Amino acid sequence: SPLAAYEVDDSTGYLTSDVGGPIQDQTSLKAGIRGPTLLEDFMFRQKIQHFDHERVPERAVHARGAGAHGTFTSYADWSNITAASFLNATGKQTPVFVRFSTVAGSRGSADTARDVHGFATRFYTDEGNFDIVGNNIPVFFIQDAIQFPDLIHSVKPRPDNEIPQAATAHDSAWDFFSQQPSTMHTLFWAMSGHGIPRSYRHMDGFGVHTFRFVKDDGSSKLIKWHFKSRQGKASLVWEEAQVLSGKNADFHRQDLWDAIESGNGPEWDVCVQIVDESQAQAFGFDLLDPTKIIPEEYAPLTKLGLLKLDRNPTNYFAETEQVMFQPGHIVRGIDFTEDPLLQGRLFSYLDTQLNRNGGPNFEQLPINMPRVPIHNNNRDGAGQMFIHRNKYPYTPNTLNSGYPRQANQNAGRGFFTAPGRTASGALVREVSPTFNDHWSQPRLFFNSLTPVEQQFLVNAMRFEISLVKSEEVKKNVLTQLNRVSHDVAVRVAAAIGLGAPDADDTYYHNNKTAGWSIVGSGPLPTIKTLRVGILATTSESSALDQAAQLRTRLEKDGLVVTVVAETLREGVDQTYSTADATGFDGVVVVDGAAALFASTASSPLFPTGRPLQIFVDAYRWGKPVGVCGGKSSEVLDAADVPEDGDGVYSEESVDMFVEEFEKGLATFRFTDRFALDS
Amino acid sequence: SPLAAYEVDDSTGYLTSDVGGPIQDQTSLKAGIRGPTLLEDFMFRQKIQHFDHERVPERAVHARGAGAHGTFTSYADWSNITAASFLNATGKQTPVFVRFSTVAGSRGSADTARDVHGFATRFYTDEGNFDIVGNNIPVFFIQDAIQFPDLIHSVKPRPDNEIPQAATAHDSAWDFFSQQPSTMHTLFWAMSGHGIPRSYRHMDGFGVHTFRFVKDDGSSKLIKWHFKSRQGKASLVWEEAQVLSGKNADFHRQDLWDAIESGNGPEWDVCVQIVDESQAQAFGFDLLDPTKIIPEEYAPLTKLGLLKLDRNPTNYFAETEQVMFQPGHIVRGIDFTEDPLLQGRLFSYLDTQLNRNGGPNFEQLPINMPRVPIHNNNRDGAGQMFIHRNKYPYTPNTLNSGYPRQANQNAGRGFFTAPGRTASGALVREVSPTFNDHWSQPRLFFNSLTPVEQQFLVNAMRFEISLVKSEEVKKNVLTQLNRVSHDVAVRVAAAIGLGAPDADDTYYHNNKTAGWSIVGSGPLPTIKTLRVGILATTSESSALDQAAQLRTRLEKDGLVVTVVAETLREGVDQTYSTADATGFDGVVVVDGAAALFASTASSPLFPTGRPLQIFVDAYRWGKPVGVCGGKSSEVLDAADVPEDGDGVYSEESVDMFVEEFEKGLATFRFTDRFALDS
Amino acid sequence: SPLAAYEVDDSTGYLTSDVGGPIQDQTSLKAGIRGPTLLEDFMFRQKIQHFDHERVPERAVHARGAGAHGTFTSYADWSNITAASFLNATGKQTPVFVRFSTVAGSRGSADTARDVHGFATRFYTDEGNFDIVGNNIPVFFIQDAIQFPDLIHSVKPRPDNEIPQAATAHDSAWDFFSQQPSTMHTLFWAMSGHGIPRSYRHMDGFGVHTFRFVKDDGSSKLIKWHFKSRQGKASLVWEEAQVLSGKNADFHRQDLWDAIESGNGPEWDVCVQIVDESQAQAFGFDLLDPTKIIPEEYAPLTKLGLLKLDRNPTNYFAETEQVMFQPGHIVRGIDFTEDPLLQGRLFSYLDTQLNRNGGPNFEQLPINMPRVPIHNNNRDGAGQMFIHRNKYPYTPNTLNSGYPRQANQNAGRGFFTAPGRTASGALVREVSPTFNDHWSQPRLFFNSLTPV
């Protein structure tokens, strides 16, 4: 409905050309009934031409993603820190559009690739569109925008054969990481659970760069944007993410779409760390450096307002595919900093839309339009939709009475550069020495994970580096990892049969910080939307009756329940043939269905051992599992799952079963089921 | 109207970016007051990017042109001959847009080049956009669309140096004409006054091709479109066209704009010749052949309705430059014929818009939009401005209830191919023998011109062919001209010092037809809008008083009056410095200004002899000229203009002068002032 | 090779701009060591501009695929059935490029999706480029090219949310299949092991359409192309295909690349079924119908020659991504039929390259160039890489002595339409009744599989 003016309804009417002539489109015009097709068939050509030209270039990065509409609401009048209009009153509402994404994969690649994730937010403010183009990880791989093609060439598929898709698990990527040590911080994040988030709803957003808040009196402060998930933080496990990439490439976009449709639209607190200009170098690193984070212990979050996504697009292409974000879409009250990564981005995103749109009027696309008047002397270009009345589009003029008027700090609520900003020194292509510590913060991050999380990170590196063919690259990787942590280097080296280099303790330390750990962020605050598969059978009416009773009790608490059986009928959502443990956050077997879990169990209706495999996979991936009905021993024995296990449930009573099971869904993952290096 | 919704008003307000953020655009952001410009200046880059991308490819032909809005009104219910909805009721009104053009010149070439002219009309009908993409000449140079690049390459500038602009007066064009005899008919028309019309308003429009009118019962007839000017036919003379190309390259577009602004918007009767399918070959040629005309003596005109242009565009680029005509834009009640020129056009115009627009959604540009709902399954593409609600865009479907429905002869007022049409025979790349007479109709045309018009045509050929460097091409040209008329070939040969080949009488004849002659079409039916220059002086109060008196009497009758003097003041529109005879349809000298017309007359305010030259040029070019307000033999003697001449006026009385002079403006051209062969 | 001249070696030397000026590309130019980046940094902007414009529109179908170079060798002089030059002598070798693909998925989608597969072969013949743009299944879903967007919209992701990727397992696809019964034959093939081949090497190629072989004397025969794998036929099982789509999205392109690198480049016998014009309707269906196959029991294969793929590309983008196939790339000795599916394709492939390339000169891309001289009056356009010497590019001319000369049946080894072809009847948008049996051949196919 925010873009309702542009909607086209095709629920009634006769087929027309694009110029409104009624036509048909099902048979070609031919010279006789078995004859050749005629060139004069305009119905054919207009239709096929349109089809032939449907595609546009995918985004150069973040090609794979999905979007939704929502609302931002301010929690206060923030005039005291920023002139930004959308923040100027308690309760003030601004429409938003958000797109989430991976980075490296092409447009049909799997959502559950291991990657950095995009989190791009447009605020359609009453003083212009404002975009915060962020990621789910607070730090970036490189310290200068000029290096971006080098990073991206290295992580994208090898350019002779275009292998591998959507993965850093190849020689070129690890060559780059090992030769460019700035990469270490983002690399540790990507190799953690933050690389495989459970959903877009269960990840945070970060602006990464230091920006400025600028007041109407001209004074400024330095800020970092943090969008903090109200759904909690959660990750997949890698082995799960891999199967899920095959069983459901669309998992994150389906999860988001479904949450919105069920009235469970995700929320984030839009927050900032705010510090003085004088603190640019007070925290032990440079705030211009996008590889560094300010620990919350040094600078607490201020909650500015609520972001809620609650409406899905009408047409994916027109809205999600065509949305064209820019950090140059800035409003009065915000300003840039001299972060050399940010500085270069400002060029890139204005330029790249020429590629995507194929012409310069991409801001006139519905999803890109602002919600306030446009007054400027920009004219013409391919695809020009406006018919400008002002026939004197130059400044200065008298023939249009000096309009449009110039807007600045003192008139017309103009954008203005923070007036205390200066530059000094030589014009240089040199890196600030203040940027040179690439290893301390990677170590702070590693130190801040729980022991099982540290093991998962080590295991991601063991997985990826084991697939690097070059022994020289592997050696170089261990050299870099060793500068962060000797223990990481030793543990990774053991999987690839190299020796780790001797400890180099220059950057070793034991400091920790709060809020980076997924495992350590406590049970989820809500289990609404989490998926429960109930494994049943049509061969026992009692099994379907147990399943119906469980359904009622679980749906009441907002869980999405799937009853699985051999064949569809009323009460049964999915067959075993299409079911997989990657489809559920918890698995329940009804004890009327125990016969399906025997080793002699076979059916033409699903793959051999599928029922048991679902249960076993769920258990092994750390999910809450259980048997409901009181006869648990046949299922749990076939699965080799101990009755006494944490996150294993066995109760006769449906109500008792569900109460226990729901504590398990909040715990989310039972990390005791993962072996640790000694 | 799609146009009104996209109008943008910039008569008030502060400058904004394209996303509504208020900004400035007059100074670059710099590192210090004398410092380098910053990459983070998004104000700079968005403005310059837009500027950098303002241009689009000019049309491949008809690049130079001008457009206006109007209305078409049907004179009757034409159901008895066509199902076309815009013709279905007396008084039914349909909005139109017309673009007029030359063919060969690039976008900034002169209006008054010698060329064929475009006359392209869009009817925004209640059953879809219908375009008649015509010319001011009823026949085309070639008989097969596949030859169009050959024609166009030959007439456009030579591709090594891109010389000459907007002219057929070079070897390649005459080589093509001489080797491709089909060209002879259109060549004679372009070499007549039809090549240099006085204005877009003083020329007719022709669809050229035979089309079909198709009734709702399925029966069809063959038609030719003729748009007959209500302003009359008028031409420049060549020497005038040449000076005018330099003094005012915008002459025809200015004329059109001014006529509309003064409430003199031009009108045409939209007419057809209508004949039976059985007459395809009855008139001595093939109605599928686009080098042939049906003489009105064999098939008279039926007036279908009135076309009036009465509103100028708001933005030239958005409306005139972007309008994208297609003969594929057809409506129920009209059909194509197997004219091989027409057949190929249908392909070209859909394809070429991809070039111009850079993307497939060019029908969404306001000027291209229809005025009825669009219901189809065309999706995506660069520049997609719609948000389609229908998420099952395929036929056949049940998930969108089978909508959109197919439209055809029987339902939904669908377009349908005339059901009587057939094809028979081999699949061939062969020209019909019925097309082979390239010379009889050029002769009919030449025979139908008056003696002075025949001389102007001979003189245009003498001019152009004298500029052909190759003696072989010149010989080849005479061979072809000789097949039309031995007399033409003899008379043209005399100017280039070759002998004409012996008479070859195979195609010679003495037949004539009405309605092709400009000179023979009698006085103009109105003199409104015609331009009178009054040559006066500031050195005599009496001269300005004579000028004012004449002004009053001429403006009363809707003439556009310019008083010329040495310097501007109240009552004086233009200086001698800026004045030229090409600016006027008639020239009057006031008796009090006689001193300026002496040979010793000199001034720092205008070139030597300018006043007299204007008068003499006007006389020489056949225009009504006179001296008003005494016994006024001094100006006529200085100019060597005889008082007794036709179109020369000499009166003391303002009233008597104006009454005589206005009959001269209606006569328009005094052809007795041009010498004839023998 | 048009490619050899365009190879660029970067194994030595200093970084340069695209105009040969030595530069650096690792740090932005800034006003001071902690200062803002300067607009005057041309090194920055040229590098980022290039990066920002690296992507081009993926193909509208068959976006997911991979290619290799090879050679075709004729087994005989086939003059007795076709004038085609690449078939005119025993042992005659023609370079080829082949791209294999899925249909429905986007770039980055998994190789082991269940789908129809593309098998597109370019023969760079000594009389022009000849493309056979085929699939691994011999029949197509629809009987008229105007329906193609309907088919493709139905099988591609639902357009509100773009779910699901690379799959017909959703409502819209099965709605279309159930409402358009022509789809049954190809549906059965796609739902068999032919939908999930073990590799590109283990599947066959088919032209699908009936074409014509035309002799120099003007006589013609009807043909069907079958490229028969020398590696044998093999399929995945579905449960395996699903896991493989997650564990190795690059499975088929890796398999092909590896086989070529190890000296096991895949081979096919390029074969035809050949029948007389008079047999258009002899086999119990219409040979103009692309939902029908001629049983080999009625028309046996003739082996024409050997196709071998034996060299991987140097640059995927420049070769594989940019190769632009067209059924309009036809040579003397081959002609079309009035198959309404084929007829419409001829339009689509010329048009769609404007989308991909962004300009009209896509035949000048090295991978698209022929291996013979080009002589025509095509001029200008964005990205014009030639400098044409002929300054009179029109026919007829005397100023360039009538060159280039027209080629036809009796001149310059011109292409010519088979001269026995005719058309007759009303100009109609009507389906031939001869196309109406949508179910017998699906049943023949099902009957011909083993019980498992």
Ligand code: HDD
């Ligand atoms: C100098 C080049 C460059 C650099 C250094 C970056 N990016 Fe970027 N980014 C691009 C150049 C770019 C781009 C090529 O301009 C893209 C591709 C599509 C588009 O619209 O912008 C893009 C897309 C893009 C999107 C997808 C937006 C959407 O959903 O459409 C996200 C979330 C980001 N980027 C986030 C970042 C973050 C958080 C960065 C570092 C802090 C970052 N990028 C650095």
Ligand code: HDD
């Ligand atoms: C096979 C190609 C071809 C052939 C045989 C013709 N033309 Fe055409 N014409 C074009 C290819 C074309 C074009 C390249 O497609 C243009 C350029 C811009 C456009 O929209 O279409 C065009 C533009 C064009 C315009 C300008 C429309 C405007 O103002 O925007 C007119 C008036 C004509 N043509 C009229 C004719 C007439 C009366 C023809 C013969 C009866 C003719 N053309 C044959």
Ligand code: HDD
């Ligand atoms: C009317 C449109 C239409 C129809 C009926 C078809 N296709 Fe097609 N096909 C296209 C329109 C198209 C296209 C849009 O024009 C593509 C996409 C990009 C390109 O080069 O052409 C294409 C690509 C394409 C490719 C990929 C070539 C490559 O690897 O680059 C193959 C293998 C085929 N198709 C095969 C077929 C077969 C065997 C068909 C039926 C027998 C068929 N197509 C019908």
Ligand SMILES: [Ca+2]
């Ligand atoms: Ca690699």
Ligand SMILES: [Ca+2]
């Ligand atoms: Ca984790």
Ligand SMILES: [Ca+2]
């Ligand atoms: Ca373009």
Ligand SMILES: [Ca+2]
């Ligand atoms: Ca020339």
Ligand SMILES: [Ca+2]
């Ligand atoms: Ca029809």
Ligand SMILES: [Ca+2]
């Ligand atoms: Ca669907």
Ligand SMILES: [Ca+2]
């Ligand atoms: Ca199989």
Ligand SMILES: [Ca+2]
């Ligand atoms: Ca032919």
